[PDB]
CSV table of C-alpha atoms (C1' of nucleotides) in Angstrom, one decimal:
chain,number,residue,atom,x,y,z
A,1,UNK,CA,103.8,109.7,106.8
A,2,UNK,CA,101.0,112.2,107.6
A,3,UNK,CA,100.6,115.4,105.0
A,4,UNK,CA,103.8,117.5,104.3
A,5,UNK,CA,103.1,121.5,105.6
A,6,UNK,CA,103.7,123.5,102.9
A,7,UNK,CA,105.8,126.4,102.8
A,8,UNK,CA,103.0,128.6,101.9
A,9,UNK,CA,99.1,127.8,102.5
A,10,UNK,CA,97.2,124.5,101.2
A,11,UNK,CA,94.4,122.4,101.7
A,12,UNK,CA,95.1,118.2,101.9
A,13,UNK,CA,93.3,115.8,101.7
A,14,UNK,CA,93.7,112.7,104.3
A,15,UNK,CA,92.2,109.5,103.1
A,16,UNK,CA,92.4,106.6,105.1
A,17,UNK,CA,91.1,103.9,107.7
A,18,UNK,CA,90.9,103.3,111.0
A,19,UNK,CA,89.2,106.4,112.7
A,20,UNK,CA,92.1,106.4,115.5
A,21,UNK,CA,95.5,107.7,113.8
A,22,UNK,CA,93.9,110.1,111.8
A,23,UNK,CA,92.7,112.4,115.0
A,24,UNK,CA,95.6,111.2,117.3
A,25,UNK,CA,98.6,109.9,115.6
A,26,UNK,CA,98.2,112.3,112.8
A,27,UNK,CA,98.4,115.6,115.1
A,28,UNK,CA,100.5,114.1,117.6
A,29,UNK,CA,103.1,114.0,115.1
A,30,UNK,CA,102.5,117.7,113.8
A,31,UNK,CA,102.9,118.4,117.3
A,32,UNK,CA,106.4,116.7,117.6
A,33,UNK,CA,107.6,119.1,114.6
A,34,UNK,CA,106.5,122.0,116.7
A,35,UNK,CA,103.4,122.9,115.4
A,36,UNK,CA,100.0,124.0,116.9
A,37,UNK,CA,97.5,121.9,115.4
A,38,UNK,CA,93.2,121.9,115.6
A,39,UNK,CA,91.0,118.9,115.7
A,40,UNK,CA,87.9,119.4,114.8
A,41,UNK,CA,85.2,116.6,115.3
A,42,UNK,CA,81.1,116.6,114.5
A,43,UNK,CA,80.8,114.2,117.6
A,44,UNK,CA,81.5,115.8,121.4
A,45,UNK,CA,81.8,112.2,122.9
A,46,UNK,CA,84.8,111.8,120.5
A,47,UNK,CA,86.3,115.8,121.0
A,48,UNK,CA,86.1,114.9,125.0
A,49,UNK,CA,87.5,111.3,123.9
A,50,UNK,CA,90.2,112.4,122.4
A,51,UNK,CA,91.3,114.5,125.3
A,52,UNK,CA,91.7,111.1,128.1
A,53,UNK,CA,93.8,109.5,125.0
A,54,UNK,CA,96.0,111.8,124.4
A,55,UNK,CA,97.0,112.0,127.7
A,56,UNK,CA,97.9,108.5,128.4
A,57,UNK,CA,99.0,107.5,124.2
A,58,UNK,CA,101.7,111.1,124.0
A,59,UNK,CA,101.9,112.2,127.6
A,60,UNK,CA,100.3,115.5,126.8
A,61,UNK,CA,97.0,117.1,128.0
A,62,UNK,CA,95.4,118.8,124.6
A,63,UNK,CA,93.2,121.5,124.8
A,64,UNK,CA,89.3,120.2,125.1
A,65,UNK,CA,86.8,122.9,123.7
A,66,UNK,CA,83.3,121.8,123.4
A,67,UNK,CA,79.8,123.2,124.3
A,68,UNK,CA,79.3,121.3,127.8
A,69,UNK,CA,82.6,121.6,129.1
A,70,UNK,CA,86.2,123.7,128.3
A,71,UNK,CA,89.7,122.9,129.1
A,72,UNK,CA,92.7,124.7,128.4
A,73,UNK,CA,96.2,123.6,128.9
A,74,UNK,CA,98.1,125.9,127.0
A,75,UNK,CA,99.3,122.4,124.8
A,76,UNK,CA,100.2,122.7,121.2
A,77,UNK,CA,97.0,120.5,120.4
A,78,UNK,CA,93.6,121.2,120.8
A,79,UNK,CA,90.6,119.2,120.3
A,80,UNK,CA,87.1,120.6,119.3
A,81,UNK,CA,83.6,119.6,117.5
A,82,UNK,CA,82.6,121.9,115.2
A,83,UNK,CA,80.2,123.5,117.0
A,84,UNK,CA,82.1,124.5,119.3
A,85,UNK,CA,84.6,125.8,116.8
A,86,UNK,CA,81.8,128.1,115.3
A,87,UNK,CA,80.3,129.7,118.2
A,88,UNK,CA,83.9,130.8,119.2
A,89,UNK,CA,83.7,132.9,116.0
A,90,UNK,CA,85.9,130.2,114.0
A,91,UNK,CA,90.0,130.4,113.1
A,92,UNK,CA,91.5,132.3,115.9
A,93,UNK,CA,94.2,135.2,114.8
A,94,UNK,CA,97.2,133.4,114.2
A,95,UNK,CA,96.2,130.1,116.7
A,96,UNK,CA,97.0,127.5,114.9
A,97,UNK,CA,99.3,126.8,112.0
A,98,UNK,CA,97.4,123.1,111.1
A,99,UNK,CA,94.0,122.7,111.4
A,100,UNK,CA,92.4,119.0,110.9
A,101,UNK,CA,89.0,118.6,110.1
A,102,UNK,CA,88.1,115.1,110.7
A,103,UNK,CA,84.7,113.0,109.8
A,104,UNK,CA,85.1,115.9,106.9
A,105,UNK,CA,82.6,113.3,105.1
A,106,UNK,CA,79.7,113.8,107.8
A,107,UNK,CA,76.6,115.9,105.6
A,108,UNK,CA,74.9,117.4,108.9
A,109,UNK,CA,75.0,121.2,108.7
A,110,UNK,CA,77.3,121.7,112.0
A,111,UNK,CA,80.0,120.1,109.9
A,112,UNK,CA,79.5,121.6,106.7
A,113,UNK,CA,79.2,125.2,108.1
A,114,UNK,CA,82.5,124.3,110.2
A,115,UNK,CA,84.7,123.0,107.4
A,116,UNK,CA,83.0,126.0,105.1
A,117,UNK,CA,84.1,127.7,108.0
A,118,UNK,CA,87.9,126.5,107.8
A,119,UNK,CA,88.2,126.4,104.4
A,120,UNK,CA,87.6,130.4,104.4
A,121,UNK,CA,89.0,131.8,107.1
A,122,UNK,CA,92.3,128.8,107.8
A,123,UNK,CA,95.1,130.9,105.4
A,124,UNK,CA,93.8,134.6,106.3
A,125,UNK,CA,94.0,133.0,110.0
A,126,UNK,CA,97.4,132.1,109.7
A,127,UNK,CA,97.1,128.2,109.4
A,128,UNK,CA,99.9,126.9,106.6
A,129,UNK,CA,97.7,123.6,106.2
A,130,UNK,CA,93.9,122.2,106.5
A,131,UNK,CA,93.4,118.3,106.7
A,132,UNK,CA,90.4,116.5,105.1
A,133,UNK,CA,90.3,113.6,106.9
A,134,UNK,CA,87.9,111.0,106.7
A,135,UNK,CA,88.0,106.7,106.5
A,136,UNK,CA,85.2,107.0,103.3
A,137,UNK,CA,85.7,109.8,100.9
A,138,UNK,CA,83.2,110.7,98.6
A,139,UNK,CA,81.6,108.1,96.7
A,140,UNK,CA,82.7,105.3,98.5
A,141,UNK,CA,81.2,101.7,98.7
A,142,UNK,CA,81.2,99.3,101.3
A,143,UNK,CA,83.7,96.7,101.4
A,144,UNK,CA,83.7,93.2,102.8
A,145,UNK,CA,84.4,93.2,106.5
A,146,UNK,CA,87.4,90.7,107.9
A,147,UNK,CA,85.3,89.7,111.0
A,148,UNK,CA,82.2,90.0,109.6
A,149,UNK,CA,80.2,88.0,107.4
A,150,UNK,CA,77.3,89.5,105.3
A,151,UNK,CA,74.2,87.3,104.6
A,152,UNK,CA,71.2,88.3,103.2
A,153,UNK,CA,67.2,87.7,104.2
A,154,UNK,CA,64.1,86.2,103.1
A,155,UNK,CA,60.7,85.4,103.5
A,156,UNK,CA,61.8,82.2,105.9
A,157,UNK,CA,61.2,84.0,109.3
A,158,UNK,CA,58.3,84.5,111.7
A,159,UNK,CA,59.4,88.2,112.5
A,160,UNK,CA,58.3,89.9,109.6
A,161,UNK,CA,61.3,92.8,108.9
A,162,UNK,CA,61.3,95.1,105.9
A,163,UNK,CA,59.9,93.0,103.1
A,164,UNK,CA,61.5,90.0,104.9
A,165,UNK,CA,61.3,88.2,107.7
A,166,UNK,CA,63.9,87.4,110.5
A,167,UNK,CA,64.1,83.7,112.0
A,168,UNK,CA,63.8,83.3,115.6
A,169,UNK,CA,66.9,81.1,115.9
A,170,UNK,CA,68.9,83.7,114.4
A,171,UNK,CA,68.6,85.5,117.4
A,172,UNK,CA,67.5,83.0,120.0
A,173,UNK,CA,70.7,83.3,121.9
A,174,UNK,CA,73.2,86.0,122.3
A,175,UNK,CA,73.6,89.7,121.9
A,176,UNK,CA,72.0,91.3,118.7
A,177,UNK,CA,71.5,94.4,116.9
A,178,UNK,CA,68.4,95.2,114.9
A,179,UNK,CA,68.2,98.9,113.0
A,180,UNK,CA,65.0,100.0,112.3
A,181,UNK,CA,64.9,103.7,110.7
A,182,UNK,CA,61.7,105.0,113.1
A,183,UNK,CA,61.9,105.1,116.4
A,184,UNK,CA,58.2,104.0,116.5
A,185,UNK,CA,58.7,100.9,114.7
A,186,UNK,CA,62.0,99.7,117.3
A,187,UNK,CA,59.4,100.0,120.3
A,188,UNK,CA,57.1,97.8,117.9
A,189,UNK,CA,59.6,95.4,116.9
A,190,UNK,CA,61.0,95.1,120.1
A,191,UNK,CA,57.3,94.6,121.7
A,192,UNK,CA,57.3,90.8,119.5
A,193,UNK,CA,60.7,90.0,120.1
A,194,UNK,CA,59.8,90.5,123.6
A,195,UNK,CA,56.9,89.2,123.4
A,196,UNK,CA,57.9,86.0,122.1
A,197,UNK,CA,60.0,85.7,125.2
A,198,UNK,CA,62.7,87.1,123.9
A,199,UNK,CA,65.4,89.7,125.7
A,200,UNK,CA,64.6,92.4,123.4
A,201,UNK,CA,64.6,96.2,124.6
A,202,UNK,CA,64.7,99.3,122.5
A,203,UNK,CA,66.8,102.5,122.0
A,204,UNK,CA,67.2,105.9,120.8
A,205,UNK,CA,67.9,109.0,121.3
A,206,UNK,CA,66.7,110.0,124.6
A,207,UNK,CA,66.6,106.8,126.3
A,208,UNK,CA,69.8,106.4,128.7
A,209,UNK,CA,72.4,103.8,127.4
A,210,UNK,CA,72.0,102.1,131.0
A,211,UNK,CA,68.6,100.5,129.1
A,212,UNK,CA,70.6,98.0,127.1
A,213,UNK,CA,72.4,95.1,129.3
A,214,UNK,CA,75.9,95.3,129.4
A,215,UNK,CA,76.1,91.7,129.8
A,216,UNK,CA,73.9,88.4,129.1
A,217,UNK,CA,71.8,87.2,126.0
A,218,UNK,CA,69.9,90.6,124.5
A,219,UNK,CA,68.5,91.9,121.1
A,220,UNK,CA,69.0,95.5,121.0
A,221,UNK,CA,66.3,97.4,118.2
A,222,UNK,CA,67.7,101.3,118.3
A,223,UNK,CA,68.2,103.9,115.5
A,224,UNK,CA,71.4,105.2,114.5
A,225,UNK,CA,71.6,106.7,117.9
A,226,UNK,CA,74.7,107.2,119.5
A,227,UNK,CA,75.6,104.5,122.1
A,228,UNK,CA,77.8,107.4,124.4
A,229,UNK,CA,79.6,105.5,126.9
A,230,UNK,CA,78.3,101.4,126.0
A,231,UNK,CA,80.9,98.8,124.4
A,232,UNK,CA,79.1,97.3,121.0
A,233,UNK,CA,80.4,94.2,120.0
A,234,UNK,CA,77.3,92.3,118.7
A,235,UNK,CA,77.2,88.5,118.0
A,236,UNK,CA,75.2,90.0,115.0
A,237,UNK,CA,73.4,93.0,113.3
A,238,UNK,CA,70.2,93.3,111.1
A,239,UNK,CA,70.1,96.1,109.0
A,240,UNK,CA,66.7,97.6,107.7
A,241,UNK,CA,68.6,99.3,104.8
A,242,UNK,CA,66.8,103.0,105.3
A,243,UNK,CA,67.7,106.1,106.8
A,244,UNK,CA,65.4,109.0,107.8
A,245,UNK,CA,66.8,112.4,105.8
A,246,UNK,CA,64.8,115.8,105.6
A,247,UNK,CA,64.1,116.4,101.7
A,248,UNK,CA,63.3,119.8,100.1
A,249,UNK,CA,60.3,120.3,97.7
A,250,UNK,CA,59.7,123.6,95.5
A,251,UNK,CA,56.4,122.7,95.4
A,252,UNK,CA,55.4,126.5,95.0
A,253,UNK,CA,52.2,125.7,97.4
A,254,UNK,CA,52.9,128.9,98.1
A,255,UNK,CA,56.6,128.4,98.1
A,256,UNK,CA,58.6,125.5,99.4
A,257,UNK,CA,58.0,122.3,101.7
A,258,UNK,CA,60.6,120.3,103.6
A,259,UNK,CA,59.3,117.4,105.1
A,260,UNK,CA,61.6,114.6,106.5
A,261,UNK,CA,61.1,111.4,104.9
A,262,UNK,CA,63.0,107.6,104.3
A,263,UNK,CA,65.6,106.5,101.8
A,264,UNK,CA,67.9,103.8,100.7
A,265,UNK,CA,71.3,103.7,103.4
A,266,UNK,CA,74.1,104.9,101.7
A,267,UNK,CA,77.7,103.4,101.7
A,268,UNK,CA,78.8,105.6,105.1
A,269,UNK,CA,75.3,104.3,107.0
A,270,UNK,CA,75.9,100.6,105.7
A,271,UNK,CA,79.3,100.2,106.6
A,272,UNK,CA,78.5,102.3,110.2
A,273,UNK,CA,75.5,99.9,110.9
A,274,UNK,CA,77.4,96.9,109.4
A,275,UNK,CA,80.6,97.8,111.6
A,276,UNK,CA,78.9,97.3,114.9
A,277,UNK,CA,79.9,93.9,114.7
A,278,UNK,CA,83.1,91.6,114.3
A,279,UNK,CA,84.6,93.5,116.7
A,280,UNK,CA,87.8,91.1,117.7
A,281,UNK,CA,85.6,88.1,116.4
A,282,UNK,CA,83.7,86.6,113.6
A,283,UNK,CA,80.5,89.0,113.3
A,284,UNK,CA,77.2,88.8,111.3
A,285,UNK,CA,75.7,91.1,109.1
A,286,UNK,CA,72.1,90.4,108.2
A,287,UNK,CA,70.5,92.8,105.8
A,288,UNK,CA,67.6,93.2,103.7
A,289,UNK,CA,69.2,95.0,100.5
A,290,UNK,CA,72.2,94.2,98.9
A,291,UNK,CA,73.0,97.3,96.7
A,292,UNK,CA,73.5,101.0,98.3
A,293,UNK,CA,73.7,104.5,97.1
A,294,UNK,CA,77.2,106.0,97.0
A,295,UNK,CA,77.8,108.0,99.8
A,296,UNK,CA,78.9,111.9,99.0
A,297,UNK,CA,76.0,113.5,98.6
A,298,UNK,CA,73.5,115.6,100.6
A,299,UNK,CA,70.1,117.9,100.3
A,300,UNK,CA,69.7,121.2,99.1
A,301,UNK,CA,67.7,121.3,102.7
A,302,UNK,CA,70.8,120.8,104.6
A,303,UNK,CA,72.1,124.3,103.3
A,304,UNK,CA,68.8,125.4,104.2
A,305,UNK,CA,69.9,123.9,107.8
A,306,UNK,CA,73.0,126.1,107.8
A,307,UNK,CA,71.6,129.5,106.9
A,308,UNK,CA,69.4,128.7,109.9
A,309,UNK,CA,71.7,127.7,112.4
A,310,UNK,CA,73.8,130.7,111.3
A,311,UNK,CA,71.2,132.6,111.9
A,312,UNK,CA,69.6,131.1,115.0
A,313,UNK,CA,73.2,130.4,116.8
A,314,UNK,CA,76.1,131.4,115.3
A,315,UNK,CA,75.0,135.1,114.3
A,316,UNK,CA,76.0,135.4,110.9
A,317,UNK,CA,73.8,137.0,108.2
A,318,UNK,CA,72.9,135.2,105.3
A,319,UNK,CA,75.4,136.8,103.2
A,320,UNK,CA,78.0,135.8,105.7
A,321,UNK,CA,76.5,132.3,105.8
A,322,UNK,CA,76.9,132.1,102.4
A,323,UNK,CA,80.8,133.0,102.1
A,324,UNK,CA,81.8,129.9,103.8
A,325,UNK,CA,79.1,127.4,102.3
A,326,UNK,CA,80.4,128.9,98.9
A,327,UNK,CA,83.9,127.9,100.4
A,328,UNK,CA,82.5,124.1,101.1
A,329,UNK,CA,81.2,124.0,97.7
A,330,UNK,CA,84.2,125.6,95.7
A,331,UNK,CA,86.3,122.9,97.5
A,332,UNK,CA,86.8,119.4,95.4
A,333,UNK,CA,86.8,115.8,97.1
A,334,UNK,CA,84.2,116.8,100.0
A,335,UNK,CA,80.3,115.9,99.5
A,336,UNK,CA,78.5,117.5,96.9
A,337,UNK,CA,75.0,119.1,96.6
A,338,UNK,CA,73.2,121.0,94.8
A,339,UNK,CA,74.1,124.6,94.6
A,340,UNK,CA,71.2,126.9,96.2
A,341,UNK,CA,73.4,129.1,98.0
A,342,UNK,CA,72.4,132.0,96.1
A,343,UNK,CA,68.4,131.1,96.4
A,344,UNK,CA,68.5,130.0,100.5
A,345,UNK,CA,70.2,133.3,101.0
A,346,UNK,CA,67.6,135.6,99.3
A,347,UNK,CA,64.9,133.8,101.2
A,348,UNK,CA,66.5,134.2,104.4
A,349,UNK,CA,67.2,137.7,103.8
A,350,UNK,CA,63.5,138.3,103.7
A,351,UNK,CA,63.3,136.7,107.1
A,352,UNK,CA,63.5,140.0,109.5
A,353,UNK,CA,62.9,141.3,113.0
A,354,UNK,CA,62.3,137.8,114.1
A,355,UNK,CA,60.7,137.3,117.8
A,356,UNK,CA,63.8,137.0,120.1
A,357,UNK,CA,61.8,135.0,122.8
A,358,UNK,CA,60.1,132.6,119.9
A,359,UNK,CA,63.4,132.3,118.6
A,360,UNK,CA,64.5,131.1,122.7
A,361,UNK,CA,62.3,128.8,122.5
A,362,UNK,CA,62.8,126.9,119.0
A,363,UNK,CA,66.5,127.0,119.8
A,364,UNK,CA,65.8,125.4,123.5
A,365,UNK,CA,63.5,122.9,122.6
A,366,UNK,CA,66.1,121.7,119.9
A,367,UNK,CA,63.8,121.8,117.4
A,368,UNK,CA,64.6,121.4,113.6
A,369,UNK,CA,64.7,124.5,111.4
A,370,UNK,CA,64.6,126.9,114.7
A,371,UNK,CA,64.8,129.9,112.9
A,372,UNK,CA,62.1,129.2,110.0
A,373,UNK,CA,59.8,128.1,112.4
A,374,UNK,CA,60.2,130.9,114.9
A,375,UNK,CA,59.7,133.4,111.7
A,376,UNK,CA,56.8,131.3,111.1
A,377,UNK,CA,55.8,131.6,114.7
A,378,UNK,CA,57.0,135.5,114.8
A,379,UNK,CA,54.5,136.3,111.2
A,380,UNK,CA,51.3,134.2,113.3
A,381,UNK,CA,51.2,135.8,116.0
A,382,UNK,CA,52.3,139.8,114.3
A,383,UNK,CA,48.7,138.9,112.3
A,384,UNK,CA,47.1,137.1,115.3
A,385,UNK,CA,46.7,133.8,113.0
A,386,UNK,CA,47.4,130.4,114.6
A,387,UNK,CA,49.8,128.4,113.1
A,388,UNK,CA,50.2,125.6,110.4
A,389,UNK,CA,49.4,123.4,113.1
A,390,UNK,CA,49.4,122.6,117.2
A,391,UNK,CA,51.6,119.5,116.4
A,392,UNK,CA,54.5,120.4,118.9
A,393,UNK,CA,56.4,122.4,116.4
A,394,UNK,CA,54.1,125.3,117.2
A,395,UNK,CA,54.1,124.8,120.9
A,396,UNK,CA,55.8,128.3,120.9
A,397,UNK,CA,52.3,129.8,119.9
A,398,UNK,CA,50.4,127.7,122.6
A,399,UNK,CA,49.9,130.7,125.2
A,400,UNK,CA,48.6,132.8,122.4
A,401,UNK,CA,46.2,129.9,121.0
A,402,UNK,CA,42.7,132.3,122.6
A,403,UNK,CA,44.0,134.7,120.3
A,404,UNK,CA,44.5,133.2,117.0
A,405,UNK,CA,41.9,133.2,114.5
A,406,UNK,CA,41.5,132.8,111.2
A,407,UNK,CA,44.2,131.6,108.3
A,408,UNK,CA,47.5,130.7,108.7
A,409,UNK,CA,49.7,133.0,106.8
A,410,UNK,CA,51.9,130.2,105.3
A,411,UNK,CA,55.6,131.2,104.4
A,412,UNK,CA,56.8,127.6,103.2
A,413,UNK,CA,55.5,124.5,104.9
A,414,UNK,CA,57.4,122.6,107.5
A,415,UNK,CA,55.1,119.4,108.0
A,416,UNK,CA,51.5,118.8,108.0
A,417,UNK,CA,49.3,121.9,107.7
A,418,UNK,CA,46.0,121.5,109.5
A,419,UNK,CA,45.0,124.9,109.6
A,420,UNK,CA,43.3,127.5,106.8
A,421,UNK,CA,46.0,129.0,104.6
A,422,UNK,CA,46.5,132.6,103.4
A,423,UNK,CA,48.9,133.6,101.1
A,424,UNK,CA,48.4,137.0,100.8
A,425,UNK,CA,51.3,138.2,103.7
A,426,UNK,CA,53.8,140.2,102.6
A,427,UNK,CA,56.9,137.4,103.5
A,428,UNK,CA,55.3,134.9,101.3
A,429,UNK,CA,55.1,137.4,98.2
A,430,UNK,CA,58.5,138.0,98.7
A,431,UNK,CA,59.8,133.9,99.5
A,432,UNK,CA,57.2,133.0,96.2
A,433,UNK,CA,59.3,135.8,94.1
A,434,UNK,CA,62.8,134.4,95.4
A,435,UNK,CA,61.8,131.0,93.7
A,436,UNK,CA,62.1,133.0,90.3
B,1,DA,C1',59.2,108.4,109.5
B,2,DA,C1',66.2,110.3,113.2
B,3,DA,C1',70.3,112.4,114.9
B,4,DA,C1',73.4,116.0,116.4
B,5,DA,C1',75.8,120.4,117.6
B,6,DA,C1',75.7,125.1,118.3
DNA sequence: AAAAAA
């Protein structure tokens, strides 16, 4: 049933439902014929989850690499998230003979820069085959749900929504989910619900799962925040119909601007969201937009993301960076984006003898762009400028703040800038001519 | 305007 191995090296393409046979059948089977197979998995939650399955479902321990915690069993399968994967340096000498890359629709950069990863170093490695598996390949479109049953909103509510409303009744009683796309607006949203008497709590990233009742009558406004270790099942879920993307702008203000803003769901956040529900029984899906945007496409800033991360974690120059993005790229039924290899990689080229403790500190405060703002960071305080801004993105700079003065030597703008603005350093002359 | 993995 799963992909044939080939006599001599090829890349397949998986396409089908049910995330469960895909990353356990599928390899356990490989495993039967007597190959070594690779996992790989964006989530660690699901690359650890794998691992307790496997046992129990094939009566064989897999190997468990992720960053938290490693596990070796010398077993012909082996289980990893992608991040994982690249900070071991990628495809192994000869390690594995099939290597599955699963979710292979996810548009984060871990992901990308892994399968760019596989997709350049699998045949060279050894591997005879590479799986592209995912439940919705590119330019999918939600479908109606067994369990679940769609309806629509309108004005008729006294919780005002997303251009909506949402009646009271329709989540008097029970165990609801409401997705909101900031994480501002669940802590207001929940603050009525609550208000009006109502079990309503919020969550997000940060907040413990233990916040959210197991058991009893509940309205649950979160994010698209992972849920690690909580069984969903919802009587029903309201969907706000936007997700929160970073966007980039060649704005040439002096150069570019990446600011993270809101857009339309597409059909792999719609049927996520919508999917929390109908679980085993007859769900509800109550949204506030009926079309969606295909899914298999991502930002130009996401390879922006990846030349970052490659240089911020995985050590890789931009040139290197840009071997296996071109890879991803060069590789037909995977998401698609523009291509600005060629540009990201001049820019980051530029970006030299960065400040190894600024750098520390982006990285450990798991901040976005770590490298371009410790550059940033790095330039300010090599001219004794403060930075764009004190908004915690800078809070690198803060014990230097007596000692800043003057303009900010802007190289590209990563959110508000409150501060005076030079563009007379030497990095921005250089980032303004790579955008010609 | 969020999340996630290094």
């Amino acid at each position: 049933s799963p992909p044939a191995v080939p006599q001599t090296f090829q890349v397949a393409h998986l396409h089908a439902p049910t995330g469960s046979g895909k990353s356990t059948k599928v390899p356990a089977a490989y495993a039967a014929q007597g190959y070594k197979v690779l996992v790989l998995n964006p989530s660690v939650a699901a690359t650890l989850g794998f691992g307790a399955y496997m046992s129990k479902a094939h009566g064989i321990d897999p190997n468990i690499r992720t960053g938290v915690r490693t596990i070796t069993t010398g077993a012909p399968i082996t289980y990893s998230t992608y991040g994982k994967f690249l900070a071991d340096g990628g495809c192994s000498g000869g390690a594995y003979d099939i290597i599955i890359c699963d979710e292979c629709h996810s548009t984060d950069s871990t992901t990308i820069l892994g399968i760019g990863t596989v997709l350049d170093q699998a045949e060279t490695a050894g591997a005879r085959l590479v799986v592209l598996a995912t439940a919705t390949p590119p330019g999918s479109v939600t479908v109606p749900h067994p369990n679940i049953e769609e309806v629509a909103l309108s004005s008729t509510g006294e919780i005002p929504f997303y251009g909506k409303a949402i009646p009271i009744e329709t989540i008097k009683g029970g165990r609801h989910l409401i997705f909101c796309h900031s994480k501002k607006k669940c802590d207001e949203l929940a603050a009525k619900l609550s208000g009006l008497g109502l079990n309503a709590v919020a969550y997000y990233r940060g907040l413990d799962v233990s916040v959210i009742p197991t058991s009893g009558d509940v309205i649950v406004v979160a994010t698209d925040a992972l849920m690690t270790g909580f069984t969903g099942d919802f009587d029903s879920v309201i969907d706000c119909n936007t997700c929160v993307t970073q966007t980039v702008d060649f704005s040439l203000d002096p150069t570019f601007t990446i600011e993270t803003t809101t857009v339309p769901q597409d059909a792999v956040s719609r049927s996520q969201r919508r999917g929390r529900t109908g679980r085993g029984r007859m769900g509800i899906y109550r949204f506030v937009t009926p079309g969606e945007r295909p899914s298999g496409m991502f930002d130009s800033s996401v390879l922006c993301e990846c030349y970052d991360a490659g240089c911020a974690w995985y050590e890789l120059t931009p040139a290197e960076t840009s071997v296996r993005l071109r890879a991803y790229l060069n590789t037909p039924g995977l998401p698609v984006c523009q291509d600005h290899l060629e540009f990201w990689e001049s820019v980051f080229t530029g970006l030299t003898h960065i400040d190894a403790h600024f750098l520390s500190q982006t990285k450990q405060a798991g901040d976005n762009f770590p490298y371009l703002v410790a550059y940033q960071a790095t330039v300010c305080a090599r001219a004794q400028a403060p930075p764009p801004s004190w908004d915690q993105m800078w809070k690198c700079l803060i014990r230097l703040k007596p000692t800043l003065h003057g303009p900010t030597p802007l190289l590209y703008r990563l959110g508000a800038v409150q501060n005076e603005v030079t563009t007379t350093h030497p990095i921005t002359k250089y980032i303004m001519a790579c955008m010609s």
